[PDB]
Amino acid sequence: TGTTIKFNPPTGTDSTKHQCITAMKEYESKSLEELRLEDYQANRK
Amino acid sequence: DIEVTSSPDDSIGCLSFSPPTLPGNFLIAGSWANDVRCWEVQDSGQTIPKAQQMHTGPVLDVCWSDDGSKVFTASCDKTAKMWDLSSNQAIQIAQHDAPVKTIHWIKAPNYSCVMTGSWDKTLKFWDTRSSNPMMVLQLPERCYCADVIYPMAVVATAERGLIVYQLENQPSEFRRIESPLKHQHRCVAIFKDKQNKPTGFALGSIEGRVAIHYINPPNPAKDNFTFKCHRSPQDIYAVNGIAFHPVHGTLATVGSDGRFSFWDKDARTKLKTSEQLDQPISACCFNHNGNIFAYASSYDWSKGHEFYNPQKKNYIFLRNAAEELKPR
Amino acid sequence: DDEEPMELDY
């Protein structure tokens, strides 16, 4: 819950780096806003 | 570009100019400090704070009523409000079991109502005076974004869900679409045909990609396509918003790269790409005639909490970019 | 601000 795992942009090919946290398999199941609201309610700002 | 005076204090999620029914131009912004703020805009580019209202939670979407008398607000506090601008009093009109992510006015020939779309995987329709939603429709997953242009609505959900609705007589599902995008859905915007009828939509993904989808084209494999955008090892940023110039039918995208870009989907060209801002561009929209392009520069969380600087300034910028979005 | 062609996915 919340962005408790430090951000690491995964690599790919098209080489690429996806600078979006939800591109990480740990996060892939939620949206930016969903994570942000969880970090706000944990007071993790 | 032109900066709006007295910007919100936290990150801005949504922007919405006023309908043609009001003389002049009034901008509305929703923010993560829980506020909805209304600025009057004047031909000089100067902007005047007029009024504010607050939710008990972050504000995710906002929109107007077609006559211009109301502003609608959808918030993480699981409600939406109707804000009467004259009296400057707001009341609750909608209740959900989760944050409300999207909000829209439906002006149909036989009925008018507010449509709210929630992370509680529901789609609710409200007459604005009853505590009872007039209609409730179930979503396969959590609502992430939507757009409305009678007689069509589009709604994207989590798990790449993508649904089209018909709004004639009463709203009802029209068709579920296998998403053209391979990654998480973030933004959507409906475009119209030469006869001014809704005809398709553009769909933004977190993977620096936008899809153009016609509902019923002759050759779908040729007529529908996806293009790359908002990339600088190539770095790939999320696409945070999308909007069609109301006159030219070209479009703008804004992404976590802190840039914005203009596009022509018929010619399949990139018309313009601005320079890099300090922060990601988290929203945008057009005034009623397209003479004003407004975008907001705020943190979007696309790199987690660690990169959130709460003392960095949140900016709404105005650009008179009508000519830049005309095609040839 | 020169007008280029889109990078389309093929």
Side-chain angles (χ1 to χ4, degrees):
Chain A
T1 298
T3 66
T4 43
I5 301 170
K6 40 191 180 295
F7 168 71
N8 185 28
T11 58
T13 69
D14 218 315
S15 47
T16 74
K17 286 172 171 189
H18 197 159
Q19 306 292 6
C20 187
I21 177 174
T22 53
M24 283 167 45
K25 306 193 187 84
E26 302 91 317
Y27 294 116
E28 62 189 2
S29 63
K30 290 175 198 185
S31 72
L32 303 185
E33 296 78 10
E34 276 175 282
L35 298 180
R36 181 166 191 163
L37 180 58
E38 285 173 356
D39 285 342
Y40 267 53
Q41 292 191 313
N43 288 4
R44 176 160 45 253
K45 316 177 201 171
Chain B
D1 283 320
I2 308 152
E3 172 183 332
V4 179
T5 39
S6 256
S7 65
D9 290 328
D10 208 353
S11 298
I12 291 106
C14 44
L15 306 165
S16 172
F17 272 101
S18 56
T21 43
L22 300 179
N25 288 324
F26 294 86
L27 174 73
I28 302 280
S31 112
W32 270 83
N34 314 351
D35 44 300
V36 57
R37 299 186 171 194
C38 169
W39 298 265
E40 178 177 59
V41 190
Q42 271 155 321
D43 303 7
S44 97
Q46 183 176 217
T47 53
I48 302 149
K50 292 315 246 170
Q52 306 81 42
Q53 292 288 353
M54 288 204 98
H55 280 270
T56 68
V59 179
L60 292 170
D61 210 11
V62 298
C63 74
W64 297 69
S65 57
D66 69 81
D67 73 1
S69 72
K70 312 296 196 289
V71 173
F72 298 109
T73 49
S75 147
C76 288
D77 63 19
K78 307 166 178 166
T79 68
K81 286 159 139 58
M82 172 180 53
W83 175 11
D84 184 60
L85 291 171
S86 78
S87 61
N88 190 14
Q89 288 144 18
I91 61 177
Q92 176 190 2
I93 54 164
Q95 176 70 66
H96 273 276
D97 307 328
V100 186
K101 174 70 168 62
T102 68
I103 186 155
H104 286 99
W105 188 243
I106 306 191
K107 183 206 194 316
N110 226 237
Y111 71 90
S112 296
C113 69
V114 181
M115 181 177 103
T116 49
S118 180
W119 292 347
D120 76 14
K121 309 168 173 176
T122 47
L123 212 60
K124 300 187 174 182
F125 300 79
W126 315 85
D127 63 1
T128 66
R129 35 216 151 74
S130 306
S131 41
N132 288 337
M134 50 214 312
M135 235 190 59
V136 174
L137 297 175
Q138 223 64 234
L139 294 183
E141 254 282 21
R142 300 150 275 162
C143 191
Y144 281 177
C145 55
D147 189 26
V148 165
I149 296 179
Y150 180 87
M152 193 178 119
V154 186
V155 173
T157 75
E159 301 191 338
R160 301 180 300 107
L162 182 60
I163 310 189
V164 166
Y165 302 74
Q166 53 212 322
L167 308 175
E168 189 175 356
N169 301 295
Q170 49 139 46
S172 68
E173 260 185 47
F174 173 72
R175 179 172 315 154
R176 289 162 192 232
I177 307 158
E178 176 180 345
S179 164
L181 298 184
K182 208 199 249 196
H183 293 57
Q184 200 168 45
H185 294 166
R186 197 148 176 76
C187 51
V188 57
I190 297 171
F191 63 89
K192 293 178 280 180
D193 68 9
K194 174 62 181 178
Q195 312 98 254
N196 196 37
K197 282 163 176 168
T199 219
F201 56 79
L203 184 73
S205 130
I206 60 172
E207 203 236 349
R209 200 174 311 265
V210 170
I212 300 287
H213 185 83
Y214 293 80
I215 295 288
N216 198 35
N219 329 104
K222 182 249 167 182
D223 294 331
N224 299 342
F225 66 102
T226 72
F227 63 91
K228 295 195 293 295
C229 55
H230 297 280
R231 304 143 179 259
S232 278
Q234 184 185 97
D235 290 300
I236 298 186
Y237 300 96
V239 176
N240 289 329
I242 187 166
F244 285 84
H245 188 281
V247 178
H248 295 134
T250 54
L251 73 153
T253 71
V254 301
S256 311
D257 58 346
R259 304 186 162 90
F260 67 77
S261 289
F262 297 158
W263 309 89
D264 182 328
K265 53 90 168 179
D266 300 298
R268 299 197 187 184
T269 50
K270 191 179 72 152
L271 293 185
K272 180 171 170 292
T273 303
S274 68
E275 305 197 60
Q276 195 167 12
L277 279 60
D278 184 350
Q279 286 184 290
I281 307 193
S282 66
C284 61
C285 62
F286 282 104
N287 85 317
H288 71 93
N289 62 18
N291 289 336
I292 305 179
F293 175 69
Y295 58 100
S297 180
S298 305
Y299 193 44
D300 53 8
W301 231 249
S302 64
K303 292 186 169 165
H305 81 293
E306 268 181 0
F307 297 79
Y308 171 42
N309 188 340
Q311 311 304 343
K312 187 160 289 154
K313 296 302 102 180
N314 300 288
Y315 294 93
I316 308 186
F317 296 104
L318 304 182
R319 193 176 182 83
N320 315 89
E323 312 285 309
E324 288 172 333
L325 280 134
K326 190 162 178 56
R328 78 156 313 283
Chain C
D1 334 75
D2 290 343
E3 140 161 40
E4 325 170 61
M6 283 173 182
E7 254 162 82
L8 300 184
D9 307 288
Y10 295 88

